[PDB]
Amino acid sequence: PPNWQQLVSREVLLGLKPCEIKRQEVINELFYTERAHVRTLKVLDQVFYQRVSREGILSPSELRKIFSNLEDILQLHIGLNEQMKAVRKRNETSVIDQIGEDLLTWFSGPGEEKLKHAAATFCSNQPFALEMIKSRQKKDSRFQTFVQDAESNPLCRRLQLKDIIPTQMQRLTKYPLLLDNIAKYTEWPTEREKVKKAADHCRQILNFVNQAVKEAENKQRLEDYQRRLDTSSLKLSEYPNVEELRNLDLTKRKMIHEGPLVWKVNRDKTIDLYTLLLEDILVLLQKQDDRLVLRCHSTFSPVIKLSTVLVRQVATDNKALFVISMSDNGAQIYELVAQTVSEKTVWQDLICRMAASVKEQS
Amino acid sequence: AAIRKKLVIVGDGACGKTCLLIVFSKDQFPEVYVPTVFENYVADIEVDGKQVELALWDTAGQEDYDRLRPLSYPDTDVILMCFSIDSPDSLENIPEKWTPEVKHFCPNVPIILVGNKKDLRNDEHTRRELAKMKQEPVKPEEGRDMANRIGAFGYMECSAKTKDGVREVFEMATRAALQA
C-alpha cells in the first residue's frame, strides 16, 4: 500500500515544499522496492531452489542450469538493501536528506562492476533455465508435482516459477527510472548532477546485461542453425574457393546480427534469404523446410568476407543496401532490400562497422 | 482449476504503460504518488461470466534493451500495444517497430491497440506544442485504421490523467486472451 506521507507528521510535511515531498516519495520507493525484490529472490531460493535441491529430484548440473547464480545476486541485493536501511538511519527525521553519494556508490564504480557481472550471468541464463523447467516438467512425475506444490505457497503471490525467474532483469531495468525521478525532483544543483550520473551507470549496466544475453543465445542459436544447415548442393567443381564453403561451420563465429532479407540480384531473379552477419563473414542462407541452404546461383558465393565489404545506400528504394564485395577478380554487388526502413538502417550500420573493425585488424 | 492468462503491455516508453497497469490493478488513479515501478502481479478479473486470473507484466524500461526486452514476451496470451494520443510519433512506431516484434516473438497472440492519454486530444498546450512540429493529436479514426491495419483484435482509448475507460481495455484483452 502506503506512500511516504502516511508516516510523516502533518507538521513535518508542512515544512516541506511540495516536490521535496515528491523526491522523498520516490526515494522511499527506491528503497521499499529493493526490499520487495530481495523478497522475491528469497522465494526463489527458499520456496524452489532449496526444497528441490533437498528433495533429490534434480541433479547438481540441472540444479545449476535452472537456478545459476541466484545466490550471488540474492546476496547482492540483500546487501544493497541493508546499505539502504543504513541510509535511513543516518537521518533523525524520516526526511531522507541528500542521497547522491550513496547512489553513485551502489551503482557507479565498483558497485557497477559487481552488479553487471552477477546480473549478466543470471539474466542471460533465463532462456536456458526456462527450457529446463518446461522440459523437466513434462519429463518427471516428481519434478512437476514439485513445482506445482511450490507454486501454491502464498509467498509466490500466485506467480509461477517461470513468472518469477525474469525478475532480476526486471529490477535492473527500473533503476534508471527511479534515479531519473529522484533526479528530477532534486532541487540542489551539485547533488542533482550526482543522481543523474548514477542513472547513467544504471543504463551502462543494462546495456552490458543486454549484450551479455545477446551473446549467450546467439551462441546457442548458431549451434542450432549450423545443425539445420545444408551444403550438399555445393559445386565441388567450379571455384576452389569452395572447401572453406562446404566445411563452413557457423559455430566457430560470433553472430553479430541476423534476420530475414530479400535479395534483389536481378529484376527477373530476386531471392529471399535468411541472413547472418557473423563476426568476419556475412552469410546468405535460404530457409527451405527446416534446413537453411548454403548455395550460390547465377557465380556469387553465399559467404562474403567482411574484409572486402563496402556498403552503399540505394537512393530509390529506402530499404535497399548496396553491399559491394571488393575482390581481385571483380567487385560483386549484393543489392539487398529489408521489410522496414528501420531494419535496413541497422543492416547498414552493423555491416558498415564490422567492415571497418575487421579491416582495422591488420 | 482457474484460468491464468499472461497479458504483456508493450509500446513506446513515454506513453504511460506502468501507470495504466497500476490504475487498472488498484482500480483507482493514485492522486498522491504515481509509482515508477509495477511488479509482475496477478489481477483477479471476470469477463463474460468466466473467472480469469490475468497476470500482468509491465515492460516499462525495456524500450532500449532490444535483447532484454524479449524476455518479457514468452508465453504471453494477449498484448496491449500502445501509443500516446498526443504523440503521433508513437502511433507510427506501431507498425514500424512493435507489431513486427510482437508478431515475431508472440505469434498468433491477439493484439489490442490503445490510444492512451486520450484526455489530451483536446489540450491547449498539447495541440500547440505539436503544432510547432506540424503534427496534431491522433484522431480516433487514425487509431482504428491502425488497429485494423496492424491486424489488431480491437482498438481502445483511455484517459491518462485518471481511471477513464481503463477497465474497458482490460475487459477486452481478457476477452481476446480467452479465445485461442
Structural domains of chain B ordered from first start = 1-180 (3.40.50.300)
Q: Which residue(s) pair with B45 in the sheet?
A: B52
Strands A255-264 and A334-337 turn out to be antiparallel
Nearest to A173 among B53, B68, B74 (CB): B68
Cβ contact (<8 Å) for B37 and A210?
A: no
Residues A94 and A46 in one domain: yes
What the block records as the C-alpha cell of B170 is 482490460
Tell me the backbone φ, ψ of residue A91, rounded to 5 degrees.
Answer: -100, 135
Residues A178 and A237 in one domain: no
Tell me the backbone φ, ψ of residue B87, rounded to 5 degrees.
Answer: -135, 85
Note whether A232 and A248 are within 8 A (CB): no
Residue A60: CB atoms within 10 A of its CB come to 8
- Provide the resolution (angstroms): 3.2
Helices (H), B32-165: 88-93, 99-105, 124-130, 140-149
Residues A190 and A247 in one domain: no
With residue B51 as reference, give the H or E element that holds it.
strand B50-58
What the block records as the C-alpha cell of A150 is 511450490
Number of domains chain A is built from:
2
Q: Which residue(s) pair with A331 in the sheet?
A: A326
- CA separation for the pair B163, B20 (Å, rounded): 8
State the CATH number of the domain containing residue A245.
Answer: 2.30.29.30
Residues A212 and A246 in one domain: no
Residue B154: CB atoms within 10 A of its CB come to 17
Q: How far apart are the first and last CA of chain B?
A: 18
With residue B121 as reference, give the H or E element that holds it.
none
Buried/exposed A3-24: b ≥16 CB within 10 Å, e otherwise: bbbeebeeeeeeeeeeebbbbb
Note whether B67 and A211 are within 8 A (CB): yes
A305 Cβ contact list (under 8 Å, min separation 6): A280, A281, A325
- CA separation for the pair A312, A270 (Å, rounded): 19
Note whether B76 and B8 are within 8 A (CB): yes
Q: Is A281 left (phi over 0), alpha (psi -120 to 50) or beta?
A: beta
Residues 9-48 of B with CB under 8 A from A: 32-33, 35-37, 39-42
Residues A78 and A111 in one domain: yes
Radius of gyration from C-alpha coordinates of chain B: 16
Q: Which residue(s) pair with A285 in the sheet?
A: A274
- Across chain A, where does the E strand assignment appear? 229-230, 255-264, 270-278, 281-285, 292-293, 303-305, 309-313, 320-325, 334-337
Note whether B55 and B4 are within 8 A (CB): yes
**Domain end marker among A211, A231, A251:** A231
A98–chain B Cβ distance below 8 A for any pair? no
- CA separation for the pair A243, B77 (Å, rounded): 47
CA dihedral A190→A194→A196→A201, nearest 10 degrees, is: 160
Note whether B56 and B40 are within 8 A (CB): yes
- State whether residue A140 is helix, strand or coil: coil
What the block records as the C-alpha cell of A279 is 563476426
B75–chain A Cβ distance below 8 A for any pair? yes
A270–chain B Cβ distance below 8 A for any pair? no
* Residue-range definition of the domain harbouring residue A193: 1-231
Residue B108: Cβ-neighbour burial (10 angstroms; 0-12, 13-18, 19+): exposed
- CA separation for the pair A194, A226 (Å, rounded): 48
**Angle CA B20–B26–B27, to nearest 5:** 75
- CA separation for the pair A124, A127 (Å, rounded): 7
Note whether A321 and A313 are within 8 A (CB): yes
With residue B50 as reference, give the H or E element that holds it.
strand B50-58
What the block records as the C-alpha cell of A220 is 546457442
